[PDB]
């Protein structure tokens, strides 16, 4: 009934191929051990199963100790597709798994060439319609979820076209004149941001 | 008495597995040669058993089926059971297959007490095919037949009045089996099921159940 | 494939009202497991089972749920009365070993005050900037899908009537119209990003498809408007030199 889970580092921010390590600590002695991955749909992929020793298995690298009482989750050259929240499901009960907090992993990747611009976007069918749009930005830009409760804005996005990657986010607003020059105002964007003329 | 109070954790939960969602092992040409008594290769169609282990409360008493054809009626479990990780156990519902067969299937009635008013109950639910059956055999059914109607082995949120509960078979040949609804000792399957280990075979002659239901 | 089925995947309710799930788990497998996750937060222990019988019931539940496992491999959650904060992703999972826990996609139940509240998505698609292609020579079509309750959606891009997963990219969390108002409207936007060329040739078709899980034939409907159903809303733009 009692089992005491505490997942360290609670959020993570690391760049493009580069290396990291979260650990996952334990009160009690426990037999068993397991390491999970959660996607943005919300299915838990069984990474590893180690109650003692270190497993290898292709990119992933996991050790964990009965004695000091702590499991390690390693990741070689991280990629995007490696962002999400690992979990730790521990085991003191008879077989009874408890999982722990979750560490928040999001892998940013940097663009070789940043160039950041908002551009202006209109509908397809409707002539009033239209929808503002930055994108080409650095990674490490942190975009405000705000302000005027009458425009509505979106997180970072990551994708490839190949080689190439780039970051957008979206802000519309429905209300007379929403220019894209006063839109992204409460977030601290570069000086260099490119402001094009519809 | 009877006390459902007396939770012991998943016991209510346990306890309607065992009658109302129930796998009853049925066999009737079934031969064995291996106090517990092996089936090889019982479970046709099982992905998690193929053998049954049959336990019984003396060894004595345990050679008179050991050899000979005998016909099986009772509930199976997995969770703690005394063997590799593909064998399921039962305790007694075990009865010989000579002078135990009838012309026209048996049809004993049953009467039941909600706190004091009689209520009418079918003959059609309980059936036996045999002369002299187990107490298992007529138990599992009569107990099934009672969480349709009246949740029995349901928590009092999931509609379950009944608190206190019993159930008599009539004394046609020798004294009645007496026994109480909530009175059976353990949470799980291994220790639910034990009632059965004497291996009582009573005569199905013109006899009847007699079921004490109360709400308090 | 996942290894381990649920049926159904999502699920709508009105307060105080019955609701159950199904678990479907690989043949073998011996046991099985009962988590519930909310948002943003690690799965709580519910029940397990091993083989025919019940072993554990975790404390801090609640007396309205009830799991059973009839006839066979598979096991049904029964939820009594629908309540607030009842709306979570519910997990279930199975083991052999009990070595390795084989998890399934999870059923997300949605508790709403009246079914009226459950809105279908209105999908648009905006035409790429002119100043976008003089500038970096590509376009990105940008799709928006708003007024939706809840906030179960399935967004994919389809490109000459084909899947496209390459230059896709799309909001993690969709953000709400009115964030202080319960059971309120949801906005979610993914942007697809082509060629200068590609764009520009007229042959090429753009496609923004979101698959909105609504109500079922056993959900009375009483309202004016239509009944929003399971229902694939779409919009579609052709390319233009």
Same mark, same amino acid.
């Given at each position: 009934?009692?089992? =005491?889970?505490?997942?360290?580092?609670?959020?993570?921010?690391?760049?493009?191929?580069?290396?990291?390590?979260?650990?996952?600590?334990?009160?009690? &002695?426990?037999?068993?051990?397991?390491?999970?991955?959660?996607?943005?749909?919300?299915?838990?992929?069984?990474?590893?199963?180690?109650?003692?020793?270190?497993?290898?298995?292709?990119?992933?690298?996991?050790?964990?100790?009965?004695?000091?009482?702590?499991?390690?989750?390693?990741?070689?050259?991280?990629?995007?597709?490696?962002?999400?929240?690992?979990?730790?499901?521990?085991?003191?009960?008879?077989?009874?798994?408890?999982?722990?907090?979750?560490?928040?992993?999001?892998?940013?990747?940097?663009?070789?060439?940043?160039?950041?611009?908002?551009? =202006?976007?209109?509908?397809?069918?409707?002539?009033?319609?239209?929808?503002?749009?930055?994108?080409?930005?650095?990674?490490?830009?942190?975009?405000? =979820? &705000?302000?005027?409760?009458?425009?509505?804005?979106?997180?970072?996005?990551?994708?490839?076209?190949?080689?190439?990657?780039?970051?957008?986010?979206?802000?519309?607003?429905?209300?007379?004149?929403?220019?894209?020059?006063?839109?992204?105002?409460?977030?601290?964007?570069?000086?260099?941001?490119?402001?094009?003329?519809? | 008495?009877?006390?459902?109070?007396?939770?012991?954790?998943?016991?209510?939960?346990?306890?309607?597995?065992?009658?109302?969602?129930?796998?009853?092992?049925?066999?009737?040409?079934?031969?064995?040669?291996?106090?517990?008594?092996?089936?090889?290769?019982?479970?046709?169609?099982?992905?998690?058993?193929?053998?049954?282990?049959?336990?019984?409360?003396?060894?004595?008493?345990?050679?008179?089926?050991?050899?000979?054809?005998?016909?099986?009626?009772?509930?199976?479990?997995?969770?703690?059971?005394?063997?590799?990780?593909?064998?399921?156990?039962?305790?007694?519902?075990?009865?010989?297959?000579?002078?135990?067969?009838?012309?026209?299937?048996?049809?004993?009635?049953?009467?039941?007490?909600?706190?004091?008013?009689?209520?009418?109950?079918?003959?059609?639910?309980?059936?036996?095919?045999?002369?002299?059956?187990?107490?298992?055999?007529?138990?599992?059914?009569?107990?099934?037949?009672?969480?349709?109607?009246?949740?029995?082995?349901?928590?009092?949120?999931?509609?379950?009045?009944?608190?206190?509960?019993?159930?008599?078979?009539?004394?046609?040949?020798?004294?009645?089996?007496?026994?109480?609804?909530?009175?059976?000792?353990?949470?799980?399957?291994?220790?639910?099921?034990?009632?059965?280990?004497?291996?009582?075979?009573?005569?199905?002659?013109?006899?009847?159940?007699?079921?004490?239901?109360?709400?308090? | 494939?996942?290894?381990?089925?649920?049926?159904?995947?999502?699920?709508?309710?009105?307060?105080?009202?019955?609701?159950?799930?199904?678990?479907?788990?690989?043949?073998?497998?011996?046991?099985?497991?009962?988590?519930?996750?909310?948002?943003?937060?690690?799965?709580?222990?519910?029940?397990?089972?091993?083989?025919?019988?019940?072993?554990?019931?975790?404390?801090?539940?609640?007396?309205?749920?009830?799991?059973?496992?009839?006839? #066979?491999?598979?096991?049904?959650?029964?939820?009594?009365?629908?309540?607030?904060?009842?709306?979570?992703?519910?997990?279930?999972?199975?083991?052999?070993?009990?070595?390795?826990?084989?998890?399934?996609?999870?059923?997300?139940?949605?508790?709403?005050?009246?079914?009226?509240?459950?809105?279908?998505?209105?999908?648009?698609?905006?035409?790429?900037?002119?100043?976008?292609?003089?500038?970096?020579?590509?376009?990105?079509?940008?799709?928006?899908?708003?007024?939706?309750?809840?906030?179960?959606?399935?967004?994919?891009?389809?490109?000459? #009537?084909?899947?496209?997963?390459?230059?896709?990219?799309?909001?993690?969390?969709?953000?709400?119209?009115?964030?202080?108002?319960?059971?309120?409207?949801?906005?979610?936007?993914?942007?697809?990003?082509?060629?200068?060329?590609?764009?520009?040739?007229?042959?090429?078709?753009?496609?923004?498809?979101?698959?909105?899980?609504?109500?079922?034939?056993?959900?009375?409907?009483?309202?004016?408007?239509?009944?929003?159903?399971?229902?694939?809303?779409?919009?579609?733009?052709?390319?233009?030199?």
């Amino acid at each position: 009934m009692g089992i =005491q889970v505490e997942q360290s580092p609670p959020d993570l921010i690391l760049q493009e191929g580069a290396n990291s390590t979260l650990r996952c600590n334990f009160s009690d &002695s426990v037999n068993n051990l397991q390491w999970f991955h959660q996607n943005p749909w919300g299915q838990l992929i069984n990474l590893f199963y180690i109650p003692s020793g270190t497993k290898q298995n292709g990119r992933l690298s996991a050790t964990t100790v009965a004695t000091e009482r702590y499991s390690l989750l390693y990741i070689s050259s991280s990629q995007t597709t490696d962002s999400g929240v690992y979990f730790c499901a521990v085991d003191s009960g008879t077989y009874k798994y408890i999982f722990g907090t979750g560490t928040r992993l999001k892998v940013l990747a940097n663009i070789q060439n940043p160039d950041p611009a908002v551009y =202006q976007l209109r509908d397809s069918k409707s002539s009033d319609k239209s929808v503002c749009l930055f994108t080409d930005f650095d990674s490490q830009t942190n975009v405000s =979820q &705000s302000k005027d409760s009458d425009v509505y804005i979106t997180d970072k996005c990551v994708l490839d076209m190949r080689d190439f990657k780039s970051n957008s986010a979206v802000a519309w607003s429905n209300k007379s004149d929403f220019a894209c020059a006063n839109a992204f105002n409460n977030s601290i964007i570069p000086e260099d941001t490119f402001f094009p003329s519809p | 008495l009877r006390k459902k109070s007396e939770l012991q954790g998943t016991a209510l939960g346990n306890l309607k597995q065992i009658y109302y969602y129930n796998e009853k092992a049925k066999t009737e040409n079934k031969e064995s040669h291996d106090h517990t008594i092996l089936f090889k290769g019982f479970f046709t169609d099982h992905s998690w058993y193929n053998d049954l282990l049959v336990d019984f409360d003396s060894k004595d008493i345990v050679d008179k089926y050991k050899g000979k054809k005998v016909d099986l009626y009772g509930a199976y479990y997995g969770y703690q059971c005394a063997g590799p990780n593909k064998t399921a156990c039962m305790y007694g519902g075990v009865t010989l297959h000579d002078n135990n067969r009838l012309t026209e299937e048996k049809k004993v009635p049953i009467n039941l007490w909600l706190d004091g008013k009689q209520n009418t109950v079918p003959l059609e639910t309980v059936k036996t095919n045999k002369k002299n059956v187990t107490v298992q055999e007529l138990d599992l059914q009569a107990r099934r037949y009672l969480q349709e109607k009246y949740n029995l082995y349901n928590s009092d949120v999931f509609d379950g009045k009944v608190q206190r509960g019993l159930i008599v078979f009539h004394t046609s040949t020798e004294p009645s089996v007496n026994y109480d609804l909530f009175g059976a000792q353990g949470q799980y399957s291994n220790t639910l099921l034990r009632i059965y280990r004497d291996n009582k075979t009573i005569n199905s002659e013109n006899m009847h159940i007699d079921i004490y239901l109360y709400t308090s | 494939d996942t290894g381990v089925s649920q049926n159904p995947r999502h699920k709508i309710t009105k307060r105080g009202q019955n609701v159950t799930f199904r678990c479907d788990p690989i043949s073998e497998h011996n046991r099985l497991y009962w988590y519930r996750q909310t948002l943003g937060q690690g799965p709580e222990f519910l029940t397990y089972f091993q083989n025919e019988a019940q072993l554990e019931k975790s404390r801090l539940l609640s007396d309205r749920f009830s799991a059973e496992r009839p006839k #066979g491999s598979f096991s049904t959650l029964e939820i009594q009365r629908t309540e607030q904060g009842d709306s979570a992703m519910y997990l279930c999972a199975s083991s052999l070993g009990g070595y390795e826990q084989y998890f399934g996609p999870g059923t997300r139940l949605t508790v709403t005050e009246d079914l009226k509240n459950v809105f279908p998505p209105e999908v648009a698609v905006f035409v790429p900037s002119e100043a976008e292609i003089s500038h970096t020579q590509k376009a990105t079509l940008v799709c928006l899908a708003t007024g939706f309750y809840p906030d179960h959606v399935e967004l994919s891009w389809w490109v000459n #009537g084909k899947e496209v997963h390459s230059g896709v990219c799309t909001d993690p969390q969709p953000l709400k119209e009115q964030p202080a108002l319960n059971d309120s409207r949801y906005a979610l936007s993914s942007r697809l990003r082509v060629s200068a060329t590609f764009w520009q040739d007229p042959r090429n078709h753009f496609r923004c498809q979101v698959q909105f899980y609504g109500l079922s034939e056993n959900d009375e409907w009483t309202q004016d408007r239509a009944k929003p159903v399971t229902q694939i809303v779409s919009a579609e733009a052709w390319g233009r030199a």
